[PDB]
Amino acid sequence: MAEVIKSIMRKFPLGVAIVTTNWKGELVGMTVNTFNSLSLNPPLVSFFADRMKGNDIPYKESKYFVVNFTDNEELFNIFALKPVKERFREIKYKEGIGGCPILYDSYAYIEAKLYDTIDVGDHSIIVGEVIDGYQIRDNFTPLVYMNRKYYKLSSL
Amino acid sequence: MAEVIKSIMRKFPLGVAIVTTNWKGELVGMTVNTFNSLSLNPPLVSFFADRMKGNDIPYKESKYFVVNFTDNEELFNIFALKPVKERFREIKYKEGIGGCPILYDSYAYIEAKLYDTIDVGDHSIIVGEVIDGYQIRDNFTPLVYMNRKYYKLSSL
Numbered sequence: 001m002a003e004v005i006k007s008i009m010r011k012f013p014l015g016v017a018i019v020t021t022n023w024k025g026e027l028v029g030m031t032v033n034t035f036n037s038l039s040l041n042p043p044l045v046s047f048f049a050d051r052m053k054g055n056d057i058p059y060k061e062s063k064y065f066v067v068n069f070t071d072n073e074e075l076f077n078i079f080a081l082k083p084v085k086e087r088f089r090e091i092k093y094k095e096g097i098g099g100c101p102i103l104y105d106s107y108a109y110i111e112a113k114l115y116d117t118i119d120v121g122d123h124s125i126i127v128g129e130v131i132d133g134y135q136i137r138d139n140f141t142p143l144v145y146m147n148r149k150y151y152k153l154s155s156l
Numbered sequence: 157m158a159e160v161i162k163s164i165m166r167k168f169p170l171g172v173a174i175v176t177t178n179w180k181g182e183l184v185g186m187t188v189n190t191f192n193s194l195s196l197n198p199p200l201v202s203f204f205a206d207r208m209k210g211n212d213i214p215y216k217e218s219k220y221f222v223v224n225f226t227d228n229e230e231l232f233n234i235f236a237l238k239p240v241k242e243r244f245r246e247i248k249y250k251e252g253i254g255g256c257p258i259l260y261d262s263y264a265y266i267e268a269k270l271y272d273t274i275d276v277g278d279h280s281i282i283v284g285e286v287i288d289g290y291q292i293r294d295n296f297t298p299l300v301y302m303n304r305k306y307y308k309l310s311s312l
């Protein structure tokens with residue numbers, strides 16, 4: 001059933017973002033395709049963090065996280081492929097709420113306070129309450145992830 | 157903060173599906189942009205159901221649900237816009253696990269057993285365990301939803 005899920009999801013296009021946090025002083029983040037809005041009242045957003053890889057731990061142990069929306073495919077690859085210690089060496093960033101890194105190449109971001117975490121199977125649902133949101137750049141090319149690739153939309 | 161979420165999400169492209177169930181004999185479904193894979197072991201998928209509109213209730217009160225993947229934008233509009241009583245009159249469908257409707261124009265679908273429901277703010281996270289998955293059609297044009305519109309991918 002695992003390979004059934006992967007085969008169908010491979011052809012199921014999903015928006016991508018880079019979630020980050022300041023985990024006891026360590027700047028960390030990751031490319032995710034599970035980001036969404038969950039609730040409006042209260043205003044909550046969520047993503048799924050892999051428990052087997054320990055991706056849930058930083059968010060569970062930090063009071064805040066940032067969701068970075070970017071159209072730079074290089075950034076998505078960095079925050080998926082490169083060693084954790086190397087990720088924040090190559091990119092321009094500033095610190096935001098709780099010291100969470102805001103990526104310079106983001107056209108928008110959300111600052112969230114950790115609201116809840118719910119372990120369900122081999123992932124944890126990380127839920128943040130939206131404290132602030134920013135649209136920094138109005139001209140961007142939104143990407144979606146499908147079949148290991150990052151596509152632009154035909155046509156806008 | 158609600159309008160902050162909406163403004164950012166309006167420019168955040170998301171895959172779309174139509175989840176259905178057989179709710180005590182009533183065929184129901186809805187267009188969702190919150191469908192994703194949650195866990196591989198166990199094999200779990202999820203979507204978010206609006207508690208204020210009562211969209212969570214049918215899934216909570218049924219043992220199974222089906223996730224329909226389709227490239228027919230007319231179907232997405234039916235299962236978003238049209239009255240509940242009218243939806244299954246206009247489309248070809250067959251009954252699957254627990255009587256859940258499988259849409260004929262789906263290029264793939266998943267049959268899931270309700271595994272858990274978790275209320276978080278004004279939505280419930282509906283989690284199903286994948287019992288079976290099918291890829292019926294190999295030639296399709298995957299869509300993503302952004303800014304009230306359904307886009308194809310540039311270019312594949």
Ligand SMILES: NC(=O)c1ccc[n+]([C@@H]2O[C@H](COP(=O)([O-])OP(=O)(O)OC[C@H]3O[C@@H](n4cnc5c(N)ncnc54)[C@H](OP(=O)(O)O)[C@@H]3O)[C@@H](O)[C@H]2O)c1
Nearest residue numbers: 005006007009010033034048050123147148193194195196
């Ligand atoms: N819900 C899940 O627990 C889960 C897990 C894996 C893949 N998937 C879905 O299946 C699709 C295709 O599978 P693939 O192996 O060919 O992935 P892929 O598109 O080649 O993605 C590259 C890597 O990122 C990781 N990844 C992608 N989505 C993830 C997620 N939802 N949770 C944890 N890790 C994730 C996977 O790690 P690993 O190879 O180490 O698993 C994967 O190898 C993915 O795009 C994803 O939507 C879902």
Ligand SMILES: NC(=O)c1ccc[n+]([C@@H]2O[C@H](COP(=O)([O-])OP(=O)(O)OC[C@H]3O[C@@H](n4cnc5c(N)ncnc54)[C@H](OP(=O)(O)O)[C@@H]3O)[C@@H](O)[C@H]2O)c1
Nearest residue numbers: 037038039040161162163165166189190204206279303304
């Ligand atoms: N997470 C949430 O609770 C939630 C709620 C609404 C919108 N949003 C996000 O904000 C975006 C733009 O807002 P919009 O008002 O212009 O929506 P939209 O794209 O015009 O979508 C049309 C309608 O579908 C409903 N809808 C879309 N996504 C939903 C979801 N996640 N949960 C429950 N209902 C949903 C909304 O109902 P209503 O107008 O009655 O709210 C909306 O009016 C959406 O595309 C969606 O991603 C999220």
Ligand SMILES: Cc1cc2nc3c(=O)[nH]c(=O)nc-3n(C[C@H](O)[C@H](O)[C@H](O)COP(=O)(O)O)c2cc1C
Nearest residue numbers: 029030031032033034048049050053055079080145
């Ligand atoms: C596009 C894509 C989507 C991903 N989505 C998720 C996700 O939603 N949840 C998750 O835990 N990991 C996801 N990953 C994997 C993480 O990005 C990755 O495990 C994280 O960057 C840490 O990398 P590492 O395990 O090699 O140290 C995704 C990877 C890619 C390529």
Ligand SMILES: Cc1cc2nc3c(=O)[nH]c(=O)nc-3n(C[C@H](O)[C@H](O)[C@H](O)COP(=O)(O)O)c2cc1C
Nearest residue numbers: 185186187188189190204205206209211235236301
């Ligand atoms: C593309 C789009 C995505 C949607 N995503 C969701 C969702 O994830 N969860 C949800 O409860 N409703 C979602 N909706 C709203 C439902 O489709 C809608 O409430 C359902 O079809 C019942 O319609 P009704 O309230 O007019 O009877 C979405 C609507 C659209 C247009």
